[PDB]
Amino acid sequence: QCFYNESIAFFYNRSGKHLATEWNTVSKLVMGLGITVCIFIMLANLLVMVAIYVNRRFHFPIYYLMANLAAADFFAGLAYFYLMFNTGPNTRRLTVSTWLLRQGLIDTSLTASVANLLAIAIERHITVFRMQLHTRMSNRRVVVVIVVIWTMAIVMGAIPSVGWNCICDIENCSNMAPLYSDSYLVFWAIFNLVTFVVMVVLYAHIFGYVRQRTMRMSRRDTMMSLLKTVVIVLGAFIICWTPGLVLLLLDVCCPQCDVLAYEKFFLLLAEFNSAMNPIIYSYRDKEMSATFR
Amino acid sequence: SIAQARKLVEQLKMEANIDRIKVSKAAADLMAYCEAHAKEDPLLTPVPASENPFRE
């Protein structure tokens, strides 16, 4: 019934997206910005990974999760680099399978990054709320959560690649992803919002518990540092994802909305999220900065 | 601390009257004993892992 034999031109014409026939000024601008952001992401995350693997001190679950996040950010940078040199005029020569792969790469990379953030939050909550003195973990749960993260990311990336595509639901197709369906966009946005809510709740509970159990001995304030760290961690995610996340909602709910205007800058910001992640989770640790040299 | 001093002198007294031997003779005897038992030292001559009880 549905059209697997058609070309990308038909899918892009059914929507309002346009195909560029040459390198426009905006095309070169976004290409340069993306190349710079990609090289920065790769360099920073490779440095983080090598620093974590080299030193013997960084052999604990939190550092393992940080290294997994760094690897996910490196993968996101590679995916965004591949996206570049395949956008603009190059996208006019892409086929269905290649387009699906190019988008699934970004999808799974960003999903893995978000899941790593959530896992870091959960591990911090566990480590803080373990009223028991040490109760050292067997160190096997970290690998379990890592493999679960990667499996969930691979699933979220491959589902739209095989089966959950608007190829056979042509009328119910998006505008920024003419091949994908709006249902997948809604699902991804709900997942992102739920992860953010869970992170905020966990960090707020941590802050409240710490304040309650430290006020007695209060009288380098711990409250100020903890609040600053939580606020930064949450505000990065907010400023990076909210403007891009609301765009999918505008596309699915508001027809005639000029969603195609700021999609590229919003994706650049979502990638800047991973570019800035290694700094947020690695600047406070003085030993981490000391190991750098 | 006179008692301590007398005890220390009495102790040092017996140290001097010992059958001391020249360093050359002691070194020669040490080298002789060390090279005579060299065949029986596994650490010295690595033994094949087949016979070593700990290797395999």
Binding site: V128, I206, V210, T214, R216, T222, L226 | -
Partner: protein, 218 residues
């Protein structure tokens, strides 16, 4: 292999018993009790509850162990490292000895011991709970003799409120790892029987801060 598997079974039983013992032990606090020759450490032991004495107790569903090694009378540089990893070091000092002598003042010897302990290369990240005993005795004594005998640089009224704070700041200043560790001071109250509550609060704060430090929160 008629019995070789019984050896493996016994090894597994021993291993699970060791795991259970480790689990039971990991939920016990370690407080190394230190002090000079003469202080109220015995009074502290009595209030809370040949070579080494171990006192175990429990407060608000939290267990505590306290070790006293004042009867060693040997070179401290050799066995001190054995106490690396303890949750805290409860140091004791009697204020009344500010004017007494050992030859030399006892307070100066206590300060030397505190400097040697706090700045040791094994106790860099271990916090110290300082106790200043003989509160009423010092309050009654200071009226006769001034604190200038021990600390000549002191410039203040011969009153308990001021002299006690002066001694507290002098003892806290000796700390050099001002960022890795924290010092908790509390003047022992005999009537209140609140010395266990302060220890509990301090240990809770220390545990929470160490937990935060384990992760990137602090």
């Amino acid at each position: 292999s008629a019995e070789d598997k019984a050896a493996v079974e016994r090894s597994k039983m021993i291993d699970r018993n060791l795991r259970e013992d480790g689990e039971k032990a990991a939920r016990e606090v370690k407080l190394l009790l230190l002090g000079a020759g003469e202080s109220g450490k015995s009074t502290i032991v009595k209030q809370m509850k040949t070579g080494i004495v171990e006192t175990h107790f429990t407060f608000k569903d939290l267990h505590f162990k306290m070790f006293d090694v004042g009867a060693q009378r040997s070179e401290r540089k050799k066995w001190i490292h054995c106490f690396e990893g303890v949750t805290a070091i409860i140091f004791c000092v009697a204020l009344s000895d500010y004017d007494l002598v050992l030859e030399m003042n006892r307070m100066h010897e206590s300060m030397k011991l505190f400097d040697s302990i706090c700045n040791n290369k094994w106790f860099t990240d271990t916090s110290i709970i300082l106790f200043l005993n003989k509160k009423d005795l010092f309050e009654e004594k200071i009226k006769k003799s001034p604190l200038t005998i021990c600390y000549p640089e002191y410039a203040g009224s011969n009153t308990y409120e001021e002299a006690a704070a002066y001694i507290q700041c002098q003892f806290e200043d000796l700390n050099k790892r001002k960022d890795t560790k924290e010092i908790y001071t509390h003047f022992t109250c005999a009537t209140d029987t609140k010395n266990v509550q302060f220890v509990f609060d301090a240990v809770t704060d220390v545990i929470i801060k160490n937990n935060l430090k384990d992760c990137g929160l602090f």
